[PDB]
Amino acid sequence: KETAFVEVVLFESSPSGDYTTHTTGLTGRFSRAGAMLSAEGEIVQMHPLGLCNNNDEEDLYEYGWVGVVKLEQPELDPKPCLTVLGKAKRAVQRGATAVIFDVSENPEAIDQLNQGSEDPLKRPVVYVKGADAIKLMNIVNKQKVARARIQHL
Amino acid sequence: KETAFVEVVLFESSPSGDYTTHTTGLTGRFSRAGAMLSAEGEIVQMHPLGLCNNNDEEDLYEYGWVGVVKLEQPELDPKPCLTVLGKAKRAVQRGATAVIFDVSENPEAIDQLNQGSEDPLKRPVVYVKGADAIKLMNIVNKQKVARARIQHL
């Protein structure tokens, strides 16, 4: 639906106490399964098979993380553990302040999500594609310790 | 100037992996020294004498914290280390994603801040008073580990 401006911040401390930052802006869109809210947190890269309640608890994630999930070619998962819409549920259920899906290689996700007017989540679910997704992932993949800032309207 | 809706979240983990939350909403206003942006982070209680470059570096704060400063009666600080407007600068300079001043006992702060159209900060500066400030502080003081969510418009 409405636009989801997203900033990604890489940050190093300097000896002089102060932080340095690089920062990259992405456009994204807000799903109807999520709340159309601003939100901000440390980015966590969730494995699409890593958001599975097949396993009870994975590791510790401190409350308030931005969960980023790079979606797979649907063809390559016939037998999943969780819906696109119930993966979001669990991350949120587990501290995520926002969820971000790179649906580049699975655009049907959009609909499943955007036809989610049955019990939507308190926290935002955002999807990205195109050149906007390329960046994110090139940042998440290559990076480690990065903070996302998702703004609404 | 414009309103700054602020949520304060207390959060505990449950054995079952999931978080529980209590949450309290405050109204605040956005200073002209800050950016009128949404922002979110772990709340840190900065001492008004604790935001002093009299001391070079204090302790480690991970980038992205919401700095909360409860302002003193001006009468009780004739000889300060930093302006209201340069205290904000340093927190921001040191990772703060937002700054929050309880100006209850020092409303002049407002002006000093709101007459800050000379080189304003990338990150938001919010002030609160009244029943809105009472809450925050009653939460910060009594609490430990709490997350703030500041929304614009």
Side-chain angles (χ1 to χ4, degrees), chain A residues 2-11 13-28 30-35 37-46 48 50 52-55 61 63-74 76-78 80-88 90-92 94-104 106-107 109-114 116-117 120-121 123-128 130-141 145-152, chain B residues 2-11 13-28 30-35 37-46 48 50 52-55 61 63-74 76-78 80-88 90-92 94-104 106-107 109-114 116-117 120-121 123-128 130-141 145-152:
Chain A
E2 283 209 0
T3 298
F5 312 80
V6 165
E7 303 168 337
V8 184
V9 192
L10 294 149
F11 58 81
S13 55
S14 78
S16 63
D18 286 1
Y19 279 109
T20 173
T21 77
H22 173 95
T23 281
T24 311
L26 277 28
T27 280
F30 277 102
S31 230
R32 270 205 264 178
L37 301 170
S38 9
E40 161 187 352
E42 199 186 349
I43 283 160
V44 168
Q45 181 180 46
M46 280 303 294
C52 280
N53 205 159
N54 298 344
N55 206 57
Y61 298 109
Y63 185 74
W65 44 278
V66 156
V68 167
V69 171
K70 169 55 196 161
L71 279 184
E72 263 308 285
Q73 199 85 97
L76 312 172
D77 183 24
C81 66
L82 264 177
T83 70
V84 86
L85 287 150
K87 278 182 171 82
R90 266 290 273 191
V92 166
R94 295 167 75 73
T97 180
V99 192
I100 307 175
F101 288 102
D102 174 341
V103 304
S104 291
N106 181 357
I110 297 181
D111 293 359
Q112 296 144 68
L113 293 172
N114 281 296
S117 300
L121 308 158
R123 300 274 75 229
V125 163
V126 184
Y127 53 80
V128 288
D132 297 326
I134 290 169
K135 301 190 213 95
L136 198 64
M137 291 295 151
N138 296 353
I139 289 152
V140 201
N141 293 343
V145 179
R147 177 162 195 99
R149 291 223 185 80
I150 296 154
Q151 301 266 321
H152 181 277
Chain B
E2 283 209 0
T3 298
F5 312 80
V6 165
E7 303 168 337
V8 184
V9 192
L10 294 149
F11 58 81
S13 55
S14 78
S16 63
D18 286 1
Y19 279 109
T20 173
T21 77
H22 173 95
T23 281
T24 311
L26 277 28
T27 280
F30 277 102
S31 230
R32 270 205 264 178
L37 301 170
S38 9
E40 161 187 352
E42 199 186 349
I43 283 160
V44 168
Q45 181 180 46
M46 280 303 294
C52 280
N53 205 159
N54 298 344
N55 206 57
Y61 298 109
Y63 185 74
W65 44 278
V66 156
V68 167
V69 171
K70 169 55 196 161
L71 279 184
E72 263 308 285
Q73 199 86 97
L76 312 172
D77 183 24
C81 66
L82 264 177
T83 70
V84 86
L85 287 150
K87 278 182 171 82
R90 266 290 273 191
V92 166
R94 295 167 75 73
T97 180
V99 192
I100 307 175
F101 288 102
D102 174 341
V103 304
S104 291
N106 181 357
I110 297 181
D111 293 359
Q112 296 144 68
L113 293 172
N114 281 296
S117 300
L121 308 158
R123 300 274 75 229
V125 163
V126 184
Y127 53 80
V128 288
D132 297 326
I134 290 169
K135 301 190 213 95
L136 198 64
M137 291 295 151
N138 296 353
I139 289 152
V140 201
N141 293 343
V145 179
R147 177 162 195 99
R149 291 223 185 80
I150 296 154
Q151 301 266 321
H152 181 277

